[PDB]
Every structure is written in C-alpha cells, then in structure tokens.
Amino acid sequence: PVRYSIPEELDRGSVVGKLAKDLGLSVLEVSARKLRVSAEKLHFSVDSESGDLLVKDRIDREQICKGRRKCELQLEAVLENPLNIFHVVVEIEDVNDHAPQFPKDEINLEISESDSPGARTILESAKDLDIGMNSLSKYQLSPNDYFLLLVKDNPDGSKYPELELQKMLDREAESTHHLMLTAVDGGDPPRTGTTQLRIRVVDANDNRPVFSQDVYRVRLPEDLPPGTTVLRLKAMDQDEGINAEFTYSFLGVANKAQFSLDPITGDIVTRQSLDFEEVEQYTIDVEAKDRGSLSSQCKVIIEVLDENDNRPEIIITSLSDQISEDSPSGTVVALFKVRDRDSGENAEVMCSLSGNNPFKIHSSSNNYYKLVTDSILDREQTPGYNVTITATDRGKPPLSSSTTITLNVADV
Amino acid sequence: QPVRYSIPEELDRGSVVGKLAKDLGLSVLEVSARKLRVSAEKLHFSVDSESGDLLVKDRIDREQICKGRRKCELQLEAVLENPLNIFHVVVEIEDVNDHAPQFPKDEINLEISESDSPGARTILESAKDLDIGMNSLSKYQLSPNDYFLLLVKDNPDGSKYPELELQKMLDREAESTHHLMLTAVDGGDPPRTGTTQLRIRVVDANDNRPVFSQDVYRVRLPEDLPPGTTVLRLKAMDQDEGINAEFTYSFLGVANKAQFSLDPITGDIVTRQSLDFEEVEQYTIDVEAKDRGSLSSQCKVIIEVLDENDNRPEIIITSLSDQISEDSPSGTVVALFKVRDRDSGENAEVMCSLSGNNPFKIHSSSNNYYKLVTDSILDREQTPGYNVTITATDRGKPPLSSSTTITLNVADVN
Numbered sequence: 001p002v003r004y005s006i007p008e009e010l011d012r013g014s015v016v017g018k019l020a021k022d023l024g025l026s027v028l029e030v031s032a033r034k035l036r037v038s039a040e041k042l043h044f045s046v047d048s049e050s051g052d053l054l055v056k057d058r059i060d061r062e063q064i065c066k067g068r069r070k071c072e073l074q075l076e077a078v079l080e081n082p083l084n085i086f087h088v089v090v091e092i093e094d095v096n097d098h099a100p101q102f103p104k105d106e107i108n109l110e111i112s113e114s115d116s117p118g119a120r121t122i123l124e125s126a127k128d129l130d131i132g133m134n135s136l137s138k139y140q141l142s143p144n145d146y147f148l149l150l151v152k153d154n155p156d157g158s159k160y161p162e163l164e165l166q167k168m169l170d171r172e173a174e175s176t177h178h179l180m181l182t183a184v185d186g187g188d189p190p191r192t193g194t195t196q197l198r199i200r201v202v203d204a205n206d207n208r209p210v211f212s213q214d215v216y217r218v219r220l221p222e223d224l225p226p227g228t229t230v231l232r233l234k235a236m237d238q239d240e241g242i243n244a245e246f247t248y249s250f251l252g253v254a255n256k257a258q259f260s261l262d263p264i265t266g267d268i269v270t271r272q273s274l275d276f277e278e279v280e281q282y283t284i285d286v287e288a289k290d291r292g293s294l295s296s297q298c299k300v301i302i303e304v305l306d307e308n309d310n311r312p313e314i315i316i317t318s319l320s321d322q323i324s325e326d327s328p329s330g331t332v333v334a335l336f337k338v339r340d341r342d343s344g345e346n347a348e349v350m351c352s353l354s355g356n357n358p359f360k361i362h363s364s365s366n367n368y369y370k371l372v373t374d375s376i377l378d379r380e381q382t383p384g385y386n387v388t389i390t391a392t393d394r395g396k397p398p399l400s401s402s403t404t405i406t407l408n409v410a411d412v
Numbered sequence: 413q414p415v416r417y418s419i420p421e422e423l424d425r426g427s428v429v430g431k432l433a434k435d436l437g438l439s440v441l442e443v444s445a446r447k448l449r450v451s452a453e454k455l456h457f458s459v460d461s462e463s464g465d466l467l468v469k470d471r472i473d474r475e476q477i478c479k480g481r482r483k484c485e486l487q488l489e490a491v492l493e494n495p496l497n498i499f500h501v502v503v504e505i506e507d508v509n510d511h512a513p514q515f516p517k518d519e520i521n522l523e524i525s526e527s528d529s530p531g532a533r534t535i536l537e538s539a540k541d542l543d544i545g546m547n548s549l550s551k552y553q554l555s556p557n558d559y560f561l562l563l564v565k566d567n568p569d570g571s572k573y574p575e576l577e578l579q580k581m582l583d584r585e586a587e588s589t590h591h592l593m594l595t596a597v598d599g600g601d602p603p604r605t606g607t608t609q610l611r612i613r614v615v616d617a618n619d620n621r622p623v624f625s626q627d628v629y630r631v632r633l634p635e636d637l638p639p640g641t642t643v644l645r646l647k648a649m650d651q652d653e654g655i656n657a658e659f660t661y662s663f664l665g666v667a668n669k670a671q672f673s674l675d676p677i678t679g680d681i682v683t684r685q686s687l688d689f690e691e692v693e694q695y696t697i698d699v700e701a702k703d704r705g706s707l708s709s710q711c712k713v714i715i716e717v718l719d720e721n722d723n724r725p726e727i728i729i730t731s732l733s734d735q736i737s738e739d740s741p742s743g744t745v746v747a748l749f750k751v752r753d754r755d756s757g758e759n760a761e762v763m764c765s766l767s768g769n770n771p772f773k774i775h776s777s778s779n780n781y782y783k784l785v786t787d788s789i790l791d792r793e794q795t796p797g798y799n800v801t802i803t804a805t806d807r808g809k810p811p812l813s814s815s816t817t818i819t820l821n822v823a824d825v826n
C-alpha cells in the first residue's frame with residue numbers, strides 16, 4: 001500500500017499526495033471511474049480537475065490517536081468498471097500546538113511546621129496532549145530557600161513533580177509562602193504552562209511558653225495580711241490556638257503550705273501570715289505547661305522584713321536574797337539579762353528602774369545587766385525592797401515589759 | 413577579754429569543753445564554795461566539783477540552734493555567789509559532716525514532649541544539706557546518657573540546683589520512657605551522696621505523618637463489574653498515638669472520583685458507576701492521608717479495565733453494484749465491504765461466512781476488507797436475482813454474531 005505523510009491541523013484543500021498520479025490514472029479515467037476516498041469516521045475528496053488527494057476535514061492527531069506512538073490511517077479508494085479497492089496509509093506528523101497545562105492555575109497547599117526535613121509531597125502532574133518530542137519535557141520552579149523540586153515518573157510514562165523540603169518550616173518567622181511552578185515541553189518553539197502554588201504553614205507545638213523574667217524577686221513585711229496578692233506572673237506562648245494555651249503550676253512541693261496560685265491569672269497570693277523569726281525567705285519553683293507537654297520553669301524568691309512584733313523578756317539568771325546590812329556603795333545585789341526575738345534595731349534594748357530605791361543598774365558586756373546599790377542603806381528605813389524594772393525596745397513601736405522582784409536584808 | 417573554746421557538735425554527755433576554772437584561776441575551793449553556775453540560753457552545762465571543769469549536759473546540734481548562719485558562737489556565762497559575779501565565755505561549734513544531702517522526694521516523675529527543641533533547659537528540685545560551709549553540698553552528677561547532659565547552677569540563696577540540658581531531641585516512637593539517676597555529693601571527709609531516680613515519660617507529638625503500606629496500588633478489573641462494588645481497601649498507619657494518630661483518606665485528584673466513592677473511616681474505595689473499556693482503559697488516581705494536623709502523605713492508585721466481548725461486530729458495505737453483467741468472468745468483484753469491532757485483542761478478531769448457495773466467494777484483501785467476487789459463471793435465464801445473507805461472528809467468548817442481507821441482480825446486455 002502506498003504511504004504518504006502530512007502534518008496535522010492543515011488547512012482545507014491541502015494536498016496530501018498524488019495517489020492517482022502514483023497509480024498512473026489519467027484524468028479521463030479518474031472521471032469515468034467514480035473515485036471515492038474513504039476513511040473511518042472521516043472524509044476526503046479528489047477533484048476531477050487535478051485528480052489528487054486533498055483534505056476535506058480538519059484532522060486532530062490528539063483526538064483520534066491520544067497516547068499512541070504513531071498514527072497511520074488506512075484510507076481506501078474505490079474504482080468501478082473495472083471495480084477495485086486500493087489501500088493507502090497516511091502518517092500524521094505531530095505539531096506542537098497543545099501547550100502543557102496544569103489542572104488548576106492556583107494550587108493551595110497546607111504543610112505542617114513540625115514536618116521533618118527531607119519529606120516528599122506529590123503534586124498534580126501537568127497534561128500535554130502532544131506526544132513524543134513535543135510532549136512535556138521538564139518541570140522547574142521558582143527558586144526559594146525552603147523548598148527543592150524533584151520529578152518522578154508514574155507507571156504510565158507521564159512525569160509528575162513532587163516537592164522535597166531541605167529545611168524545616170517555621171510560621172513564627174514566615175507564615176505563608178507563594179511560589180511559581182512551570183512546566184516546559186521539548187519543541188520548537190517551546191511553550192510553558194505555569195501554576196502558582198500557595199503554601200500556608202499550620203501551627204505546631206514547638207515553642208514553649210516563656211516567662212517575662214527568669215528570676216522573680218519581691219520584698220514583703222511579715223505583718224502583711226493573708227489573702228494579699230503577693231505577685232503576678234507573666235508568660236507568653238509564641239504558638240497559636242490550642243498549642244498556645246498554658247497554665248501555671250507549683251513545681252515545688254509543700255512550698256504552697258500558706259501560698260496559693262491562680263493558674264488562670266497566674267497570680268500568687270498568701271493564705272496565712274508569715275513570721276520573720278521562722279523562715280526569713282522563701283524560694284519556690286513555678287513552671288508553666290501548655291496543652292502539650294512543653295513546660296518552662298522560673299524561680300521566685302521572696303524576702304520577709306522583720307517587724308517589731310516580739311516584746312523583750314527579762315530573765316533573772318541569779319540574785320542574792322540574803323544581803324548583808326553593812327553593804328557598802330557599789331555592792332552587787334542582783335543579776336539579770338534581756339532577750340528579744342526580733343533582729344536589727346528591733347533587737348536593741350533600753351531599760352530603766354523605778355528610781356525610788358537607791359539602787360542603780362549598770363550594763364556589762366553582751367546584754368547582761370548588773371543591779372547594784374549606789375549608796376549605803378539603813379535597815380530602819382526599809383528592811384526589804386521590791387523593785388519594778390522596765391525594759392523597752394528600740395524599734396517602732398517600742399514594746400516594754402516590766403518585772404517585779406523582792407529582796408530582803410537582815411542584820412545579825 | 414572573754415575566754416573562748418572550740419568544740420565539734422554532737423558530742424557525748426560528759427565531754428570536756430574546756431578547763432574554764434583553771435583558765436580563770438578559781439580552783440576547786442572557789443568552785444565548790446562559791447556556787448558556780450554555767451548558763452546559756454536554751455542549753456545545759458555542768459561542772460563537777462572534783463575536777464572543776466566545763467562538761468556538756470545536753471547533746472548539742474549545730475544545725476538546730478544555728479541553721480544557715482555563717483558561724484556559731486554560744487555565749488555562755490558563769491555565776492559565782494557571795495560574792496556574786498558574772499563571767500563571759502564564747503564557744504564556737506565546729507561543723508561535722510553528719511547530715512547527708514537528701515532530695516525532697518525519692519521518686520521524680522517528669523512528662524516531656526517529644527517535639528521539644530534540642531538545647532532546652534529544665535530546672536529540677538535542688539537537694540537540701542543542713543551542713544554549712546565545707547560539709548555543704550558541692551556538686552551534682554547524673555548517670556551518663558546520650559540524650560541528656562546535666563548542668564549545675566546556683567540560685568540567689570546560695571544553694572546549688574541542677575537543670576537538664578538536652579543535646580539530642582527525643583522520639584517516643586523509638587523509646588517511650590527513660591529512667592535516670594540523679595546524685596548530689598557534698599565536699600567533706602568522708603563524702604556523702606544523696607540519690608534520687610527520676611522517671612521521664614515522653615509524651616506524643618505530631619511529627620509523624622500517616623503512611624500507606626505501598627506507594628503504588630495496581631488492580632485489574634473487568635468492565636462488566638456492577639456498580640457499588642468495594643473495589644479496594646486501603647491500609648495505612650500513624651506511628652503517633654491518640655489524637656495525633658487519627659487520620660482520614662482523601663482524593664487528592666479532582667474529578668477522578670467521578671464514579672468512585674471513598675469511605676475514609678474504613679479506608680474503602682468503591683465504584684458507583686459501571687466502566688467501559690472503550691472509554692478509558694486505565695485510571696490514575698492520587699490519594700492522600702491526612703491526620704488531625706496538616707501532615708499528609710500521597711500514594712498513587714492506578715487501575716486497569718479488562719475488555720469484555722460486549723460489542724458485536726458491524727458489517728459495513730462500502731460499495732455495491734446493482735446491475736451485474738451476465739458475461740462476468742470468474743473472479744470478477746461484485747461487492748466490497750469491511751467489518752468493524754469496537755473491542756480489542758482476540759475479542760476483536762472476526763470470522764465471517766456466507767450462505768454458499770450462490771456462486772459468490774469472498775477472498776480477503778489487506779485490512780479487514782473481504783472482496784466479494786463470483787467464482788463461477790451464472791446465467792440469468794436460470795435465476796435472475798440472488799438474496800445473499802452474510803454473517804459475521806466474533807472470536808471471543810461468547811461469540812457475538814451480526815448478519816446483513818444484500819440483494820444482487822443480473823442484467824443482460826443483449
């Protein structure tokens with residue numbers, strides 16, 4: 001069978017080939033023998049004037065052949081008296097008229113921030129109706145720091161592009177990315193189909209909640225009433241949504257014996273008054289944990305200020321009841337000292353006696369005070385003295401405590 | 413000038429603090445005659461008349477009376493009577509390493525998120541050492557492991573607290589729970605160690621995407637399969653646990669599920685409309701699995717349709733001659749026709765036959781054209797016209813046959 005070649009999509013009236021001239025049929029014979037050229041679901045014509053094969057229907061190679069490697073239409077021609085049938089084979093040359101194009105111009109992708117580097121995400125492949133050289137040739141994308149592109153082929157022979165990311169993403173730095181994806185076919189001239197990809201990063205739980213300060217310090221007096229909001233804590237989570245909701249908790253145990261913490265507000269209050277003489281300062285560890293297991297710890301130390309709330313006590317360590325009547329001036333009759341629970345200026349003491357007695361009080365080293373008689377005494381005036389001595393503090397407000405003691409002298 | 417003595421704590425009763433009477437020169441006569449009393453605040457001491465020395469009466473605990481204070485000086489005093497007098501004594505208590513460092517709790521339970529960034533720090537409860545000075549806490553050390561490293565830092569009060577610094581990020585899909593040893597050692601002779609075992613439980617994060625068993629699924633199906641058929645069941649797993657392990661299947665491609673439906677709970681993919689091999693021979697579909705997060709994984713499922721002999725062959729008469737010459741020789745062509753079958757393969761090959769009563773015979777030219785010629789001469793006087801029935805039968809199971817009846821007439825030139 002005679003074979004001819006013709007590029008597709010040719011204009012009507014184009015000359016495929018001179019098959020009648022190839023068979024040596026004269027114009028008289030072409031006219032006399034009714035010459036009809038037939039193909040399956042197609043029309044062709046031969047005009048009596050030129051007696052050649054001319055196209056009658058615009059032919060699309062991609063419509064009738066699709067993915068077939070080569071296209072050969074087996075047309076036939078009919079002659080009559082004498083009657084005969086002839087077979088001709090026609091090859092349709094492909095023309096790069098169908099540019100590669102993506103199913104959708106805009107492609108939206110949602111990728112998790114927590115995705116590991118080196119992951120792969122398959123994308124919709126491009127479509128090129130052209131076959132062979134004019135088919136799709138290569139995929140290339142806009143250059144970016146985050147992403148790299150790979151091209152792999154599925155079993156039917158088409159090429160699909162998938163994305164491999166070199167560096168893990170972070171929406172707290174850049175939330176959304178826009179990129180350009182291009183597909184190019186191998187032909188002259190080359191045509192390109194472009195689709196812009198919009199990638200939005202969804203929040204993960206990779207940022208821990210962080211306090212404003214690493215160490216919190218506040219100074220409080222021991223007379224502060226319970227229920228007082230001693231401190232307010234501050235913390236923030238750079239995440240968003242469920243991954244950004246956190247609560248405060250006392251990491252230490254038994255430190256909140258008199259303390260309370262509101263995790264909703266972050267507040268720290270006291271439920272029982274403090275005593276400087278018991279514990280001078282508290283060190284507590286408080287940690288914030290979000291809905292995930294991300295937790296962060298900060299240390300809160302508080303110092304208690306001493307207040308003059310403890311009165312001084314007088315203690316007579318020793319005293320002499322039987323005193324000789326001939327005692328001279330400067331004779332020691334009693335010994336005592338003072339004790340104060342407070343500290344600082346609230347601990348220093350100033351003490352005094354009644355003054356009706358001749359007795360005078362001297363101060364020795366430490367806080368020990370000797371009670372002596374400054375003048376000689378006669379028993380006829382008074383045989384025994386009871387003395388009331390007052391000891392007053394030096395802090396605000398001064399606390400004074402007094403003691404009465406009895407001493408008797410007999411002259412024999 | 414007050415006399416000073418030094419004594420280690422926790423001494424037995426009857427121990428000699430110092431020879432205060434000989435240091436003051438009182439002698440046994442004055443110690444016995446003049447009532448000598450040794451007094452301190454909240455403490456007891458005794459002087460035996462025979463030796464006239466300072467003896468302890470109460471076991472003294474330096475941590476009890478001093479706690480965190482830098483130095484310990486008990487201000488003793490001595491009292492004499494007739495004549496009565498007071499003397500000042502200062503006694504320093506030397507610390508003895510008798511209190512071992514001990515942590516507040518023996519068992520430490522910690523919950524750490526797998527997604528925690530490497531290099532993070534987590535403060536732990538500090539140990540307590542009642543001893544002051546040298547005998548106080550000195551260093552923290554833990555059992556060596558690849559994931560964790562230990563740091564020791566001091567808070568404002570002067571104590572040492574340990575915090576954990578992570579070198580390599582954890583992964584509970586590899587090892588769920590870790591057990592470690594925390595040790596605190598004080599600087600004394602002999603050194604004492606307080607040890608607490610800490611239990612770390614790694615909590616699941618959303619770092620593992622769900623993955624299918626295979627990347628490419630392929631199945632072959634016949635076109636006669638009824639709709640509603642469960643075409644395939646998909647299998648996939650998420651190495652995470654809990655909410656982060658619940659995922660659904662979805663059609664990544666668009667319009668590919670025109671006749672397909674997918675139940676993501678079971679993972680099933682069914683067909684809702686019958687297929688036609690002559691329309692689309694093979695389907696390529698992209699299916700993706702997505703968890704509660706945006707972690708997604710893609711697999712490609714391609715299916716092939718099997719051709720079934722459901723399309724019978726059609727006979728097409730391209731040309732025919734109504735007036736046939738009576739002088740027609742043997743082998744002259746009276747008709748031309750061809751056969752067309754939509755199917756492919758053996759289901760496309762055809763075998764056709766005619767009645768055979770007529771002299772006509774069919775010989776095959778190129779393609780599927782069978783040129784209808786007459787093998788023998790016929791005369792019109794015997795029979796002027798023939799009815800011819802030609803039957804075309806398929807070659808696939810079950811054979812499909814279609815026939816056409818053409819009329820041929822003979823004309824006499826005379």
Ligand SMILES: *[C@H]1O[C@H](CO)[C@@H](O)[C@H](O)[C@@H]1O
Pocket residue numbers: 182183184190191192193
């Ligand atoms: C795609 O790329 C081709 C070159 O391969 C260009 O000619 C076209 O304009 C588009 O940019």
Ligand SMILES: *[C@H]1O[C@H](CO)[C@@H](O)[C@H](O)[C@@H]1O
Pocket residue numbers: 192193194195
């Ligand atoms: C992407 O870019 C191409 C040019 O290369 C355009 O023709 C197309 O419409 C899309 O904007």
Ligand SMILES: *[C@H]1O[C@H](CO)[C@@H](O)[C@H](O)[C@@H]1O
Pocket residue numbers: 390392398399400401
């Ligand atoms: C001792 O002195 C104080 C004032 O310093 C008084 O408030 C107290 O009642 C006592 O007389």
Ligand SMILES: *[C@H]1O[C@H](CO)[C@@H](O)[C@H](O)[C@@H]1O
Pocket residue numbers: 388390400401402403404
């Ligand atoms: C000094 O004053 C106190 C009261 O402040 C008395 O209790 C004491 O007996 C002395 O007279």
Ligand SMILES: *[C@H]1O[C@H](CO)[C@@H](O)[C@H](O)[C@@H]1O
Pocket residue numbers: 595596597603604605606
């Ligand atoms: C802690 O460490 C000290 C010195 O390393 C040991 O003496 C003690 O028994 C404990 O192991």
Ligand SMILES: *[C@H]1O[C@H](CO)[C@@H](O)[C@H](O)[C@@H]1O
Pocket residue numbers: 595605606607608
């Ligand atoms: C923890 O471990 C130490 C030794 O490191 C022991 O001495 C201690 O009694 C506890 O078992």
Ligand SMILES: *[C@H]1O[C@H](CO)[C@@H](O)[C@H](O)[C@@H]1O
Pocket residue numbers: 805811812813814
């Ligand atoms: C034509 O012939 C086939 C068998 O060759 C039959 O099955 C069909 O029904 C028709 O009669």
Ligand SMILES: *[C@H]1O[C@H](CO)[C@@H](O)[C@H](O)[C@@H]1O
Pocket residue numbers: 801802803813814815816
């Ligand atoms: C040709 O043969 C077919 C199949 O046998 C018949 O159905 C038809 O009527 C004609 O006789």
Ligand SMILES: [Ca+2]
Pocket residue numbers: 008009060061062097098
């Ligand atoms: Ca075209």
Ligand SMILES: [Ca+2]
Pocket residue numbers: 061062094095096097098129130
């Ligand atoms: Ca084309």
Ligand SMILES: [Ca+2]
Pocket residue numbers: 096097098099100128129130134135136185187
């Ligand atoms: Ca193309």
Ligand SMILES: [Ca+2]
Pocket residue numbers: 170171172173206207
């Ligand atoms: Ca981040």
Ligand SMILES: [Ca+2]
Pocket residue numbers: 113171172203204205206207238239240
């Ligand atoms: Ca985040």
Ligand SMILES: [Ca+2]
Pocket residue numbers: 205206207208209237239243244290292294
């Ligand atoms: Ca968080």
Ligand SMILES: [Ca+2]
Pocket residue numbers: 222275276277309310
């Ligand atoms: Ca107080």
Ligand SMILES: [Ca+2]
Pocket residue numbers: 222276277306307308309310341342343
């Ligand atoms: Ca106080």
